[PDB]
Design a binder for this molecule. Structure first.
Ligand SMILES: CCCCCCCC(=O)OC[C@H](COP(=O)(O)O[C@@H]1[C@H](O)[C@H](O)[C@@H](OP(=O)(O)O)[C@H](OP(=O)(O)O)[C@H]1O)OC(=O)CCCCCCC
Ligand SMILES: CCCCCCCC(=O)OC[C@H](COP(=O)(O)O[C@@H]1[C@H](O)[C@H](O)[C@@H](OP(=O)(O)O)[C@H](OP(=O)(O)O)[C@H]1O)OC(=O)CCCCCCC
Ligand SMILES: CCCCCCCC(=O)OC[C@H](COP(=O)(O)O[C@@H]1[C@H](O)[C@H](O)[C@@H](OP(=O)(O)O)[C@H](OP(=O)(O)O)[C@H]1O)OC(=O)CCCCCCC
Ligand SMILES: CCCCCCCC(=O)OC[C@H](COP(=O)(O)O[C@@H]1[C@H](O)[C@H](O)[C@@H](OP(=O)(O)O)[C@H](OP(=O)(O)O)[C@H]1O)OC(=O)CCCCCCC
Ligand SMILES: [K+]
Ligand SMILES: [K+]
Ligand SMILES: [K+]
Ligand SMILES: [K+]
Lengths: 332, 332, 332, 332
């Protein structure tokens, strides 16, 4: 009844406060933020940038036109040649700035060979133009390609279960791929979250404790086509070792599950997460099979993914008791 | 005689059904799909987008021209200035929209300083223009660069063999690189696939079982220039431990082989796969050498890659028997 | 009192000298440098490139105009057609070159069907134009996206502490994430730096010695949301094994701490670093908790991140003594 | 005296022959090749593509102009409007095609509202135009960014040495970073190459044998600022175990050394290689220190990198003898 540190969607429930350097540290990493903001903001931002360069140069050109005396003779004649043809005022100067930076260049307003400063400005503005474009491309490219989007076609079981496999008592949860694209170099991790006090009397607000999914033997690496059921064998070195079915409806703790892997197309690691509270773990259940064979191939029924069935055959005590008891019977 | 879970090309034989959230989960990951569809579709899609913005703006301009009364005086005179010169109708309005968004800007149809709304629209459309381009670039860039294409210059042997190496009985298959480019940080994995029932009576439609290629000792990492022969030593902890040559023509199971590595040029992980059925494994054979030395260098003959030869010297029983028997003789 | 090999910001304090091949080796890797230089330099560089192609082609066109005799008849008539209309001199030839390469193409200066060489040149220059753009985009894209920028939203504690946890004496330092974005596949490393002489009398100017953070058990991998305290248990195989609280104010050595992980958005590994001198390590202290629970969620107070408190309960001798002593008492 | 499998530059000495599917497998991976070819080829290729689309469309337009009867009335009048203004022939049709696809759009040749087919063609060509650009960008971007270029600022010692460290006999070679940029998540690998015959009489043309650099303890991971000396301790499980100083001037084999790591700026793994023949290994030597301290910092003299000095104190027998002998003395 304490609270949820990671929601079921993987979303983490926490907030940072009194971060001192936040503004100056965010300026240096500035690109990283820019790509996480809503599109409309990233866009409006860029159109803001465009608009600003158009107005700036537009003004310069208008200033030049004003001083040269072009405003009064925009088209020139035999005895007089303007800096930029057909700039009669502000809006005209604005239009030419846009036409130039965008490279539309209708040509009705046009630079002449007269002013080196007008020429120069055109030069500068062109270069400027490319620069802004380049940033926009990259930004869009980057944001467009974010691998965290892939985590939404990855799936966790609504519950985790505990049950026997091959003589061992195991915590299990299930994972699945909702795309026919592969998750490359995928692997998993699990952790038990809960506050604790060390024998020295040190309070750890939330301690994160590894749940061994087979990392040592290289078994945490998975090949995920059909849903895989992930197994934690509860043993001497397990944090759940002394926990029984009744300890599940009493205790407060949380199990955090991770799936890391690479989006096949971009080879960019995505990390998917979810969470099981002690009250979301079903003791004595087993997952319903989603895979079955038909004729020339295999199929997965995904409506059975979350479903579990009761195994009355399941022991209600902790692995600890289970073990210790084995050594009474076997001891006498 | 059951069926093949992964084809020989690496293609997986399975299909997902009754996935509930598929539409809304695919919208969030939408970029990931977009790059896997056939070119013509991704392209037609984008030309569809272009076409749509040209028509949309074209319409706006035509509406503006209509209301301003430009349709009747497209070129204007001393007493009258149009919003956009030379828009006499729909097609004219269309052309200007394209000329503008594409930045061709022939200039025959041209914005004037008269309408702020025409100007604004031009502004908006330009910005819009960049945006669509940017998406196209990224999409093409991404799709163009997909690392899974590299898996087609990587190679597996048509068969796997079992045979003795240095006193040990080993399952072996071969892998090869068809490019002179390196596969960076490459490593392998193998798995035995087959359905099973746990001693608790739990049916696992297909259980995936690790075949140890040396992960523990860091030996699953390979340096692949010439074809490497991959070895699984069949021992106490091997899933093939109790399997003999006769069990091979009887049993139904499958071995799945993986090669993961990085495309040298892009450093993007590609994953190559293939499969050996118990009936594709040749007991008592050995691979033909594809590498030989000549003068100033080494050469690889790839026509010998798949070829195997008989070793009548090979034991036909399981590693299990082989071991157990050693301990009769050595026991008496 | 020797010196600092890595500053606290992670910056390494060292310089390379008498590198022989530096110029020719840097030319081959040239792209890598280009993206690390200040913007203004990368930009000025590119505008330098632009400017150079505009002048080059501008000259060609002017040469062509000169020879054709266009300088004297820029607009032509019934009996004479220029190579490029309206090029009356250098600046005119310059303007057309820019208009062409930038694709502004106002159109006042325009190629005609007369000179195949003018046409060809236009062809060449256009192609050239794209090429330079493409480089600029990539450069900007690349530099824009550098993952090392992310290391500035990652955090280390100003000090490291030594203290007891669960019956063991541990060196600890703390790490934190200043963004709500995740650090994917993150893990840590630590090293003791100091010069030494092997029993063979070989001097190692600075030897780098692994500080075990749990790599073997897969515990060096972390899930970083709230600040994690990193623990080195000082034991038989620890380089700090024979060090006590008094050895800390005497000895000269340095501990180097690393955090490697992936920027969530780009999946590009960043590496963060910092350093603790023996004089920056606080013996007998403990970190102040930055995480606390409120109602519907958790919060982190970052002003407590660096803060430590005294634990007078802490032993002042080395793990070595501590152990050895245990085996007097337990031995008698 | 056999031959070198990897040259000292890392270049591998081998060639593939009789690869059967080479053309069709290379078509699918086609992008991968495109980026490894010389610039001039990738460029000429693209200019080839451009040129081809300009000519193609140019022809279409000319065909349209021909049929419409524009060739005879390029500028039109009150009673007649051309498809595209000012196309009088082939070259004119060519110019307009280029002006259109490049978006220069001088405007002297210009589409009119008359032909829907001309309009359509313009539409199509524009779209086409973007597509080719996009490919070019990506290609240039990709090729520009190749991480294998970084391997040229990474360094190996010209020789490897064997010598005692802390009571153990070790094969050592040295590695170095020629840039002030870091090599992220770097690690090493080594291998002994030589042909062999298994006790079963199976010939392995070249067997690749792991040289343990500490992978098991996680010590193959390095932090490379100053040059690191890499150590292989020659022990029971070492392939060099039974090799002595005299076996070095006799035997033929090769040691292959690898350094894998990530370019700091792009986080793209590069793999550096080199090789030591038994005749390139200096028994009884030690590397000259390249690092020294001065005042406020550290410096590296790179001219000392390759240099080694004699240690007459060094044993000339194999680790094997060395060990076995220890157990005579200690045995009697
Ligand atoms: C015309 C200008 C129209 C315009 O400005 O934006 C419209 C549209 C919506 O973007 P919008 O501003 O609503 O921003 C997204 C919105 O919040 C989504 O619901 C988020 O998904 P999720 O719920 O968090 O998963 C997403 O998160 P993330 O993606 O930031 O993580 C946000 O970016 O943007 C396009 O799709 C590209 C259109 C290209 C044309
Ligand atoms: C003009 C417009 C012409 C046009 O629209 O497409 C033509 C052509 C064919 O593409 P197309 O639509 O046939 O799509 C590809 C086709 O299915 C291949 O056979 C697939 O290879 P594989 O058998 O699965 O290995 C490939 O798979 P993947 O690549 O999706 O995985 C598909 O993309 O596309 C270009 O090559 C780029 C041309 C650039 C100009
Ligand atoms: C107009 C032309 C204006 C122009 O030429 O540059 C201005 C500005 C400053 O760049 P500038 O030349 O000062 O170069 C950066 C400056 O040294 C920063 O302080 C560095 O940060 P840090 O202290 O090392 O962390 C940074 O390091 P790194 O990033 O190289 O590592 C340097 O690149 O550049 C833009 O931001 C993009 C503007 C886009 C418009
Ligand atoms: C104008 C058109 C001029 C033009 O077409 O090319 C000139 C120039 C040379 O390229 P070039 O054709 O000589 O091709 C490179 C040449 O072989 C290098 O010596 C190679 O380096 P290395 O010895 O193998 O290390 C390199 O290998 P890799 O890079 O393929 O691995 C080759 O690409 O290309 C540019 O630098 C970009 C210029 C941008 C303007
Ligand atoms: K234009
Ligand atoms: K134009
Ligand atoms: K243009
Ligand atoms: K124009």
């Amino acid at each position: 009844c304490r609270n949820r540190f990671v929601k079921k969607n993987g979303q983490c429930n926490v907030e940072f406060t009194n971060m001192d350097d936040k503004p100056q540290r965010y300026i240096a990493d500035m690109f990283t933020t820019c790509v996480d903001i809503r599109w409309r903001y990233m866009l409006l931002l860029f159109s803001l940038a465009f608009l600003v360069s158009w107005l700036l140069f537009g003004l310069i050109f208008w200033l030049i036109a004003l001083i040269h005396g072009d405003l009064e003779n925009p088209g020139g004649d035999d005895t007089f040649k303007p800096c930029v043809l057909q700039v009669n005022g502000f809006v005209a100067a604005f239009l030419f700035s846009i036409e130039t930076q965008t490279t539309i260049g209708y040509g009705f307003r046009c630079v002449t060979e007269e002013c080196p400063l007008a020429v120069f400005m055109v030069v500068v503005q062109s270069i400027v133009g490319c620069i802004i474009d380049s940033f926009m491309i990259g930004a869009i490219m980057a944001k467009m390609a974010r691998p965290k989007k892939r985590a939404q076609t990855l799936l966790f079981s609504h519950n985790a279960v505990v049950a026997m496999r091959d003589g061992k008592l195991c915590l299990m949860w299930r994972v699945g791929n909702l795309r026919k694209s592969h998750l490359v170099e995928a692997h998993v991790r699990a952790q038990l979250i809960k506050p604790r006090i060390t024998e020295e009397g040190e309070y750890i607000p939330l301690d994160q404790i590894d749940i061994d999914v087979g990392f040592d033997k290289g078994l945490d690496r998975i090949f995920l086509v059909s849903p895989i059921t992930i197994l934690h064998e509860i043993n001497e070195d397990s944090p759940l070792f002394g926990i029984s079915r009744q300890d599940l409806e009493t205790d407060d703790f949380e199990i955090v599950v991770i799936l890391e892997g690479m989006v096949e197309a971009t080879a960019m690691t995505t990390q998917a997460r979810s969470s099981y509270l002690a009250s979301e773990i079903l003791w004595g259940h087993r997952f319903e099979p989603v895979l079955f064979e038909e004729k020339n191939q295999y199929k997965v029924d995904y409506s059975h993914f979350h479903k579990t069935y009761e195994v009355p055959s399941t022991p209600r005590c902790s692995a600890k008791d289970l073990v210790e008891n084995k050594f009474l019977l076997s001891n006498s």
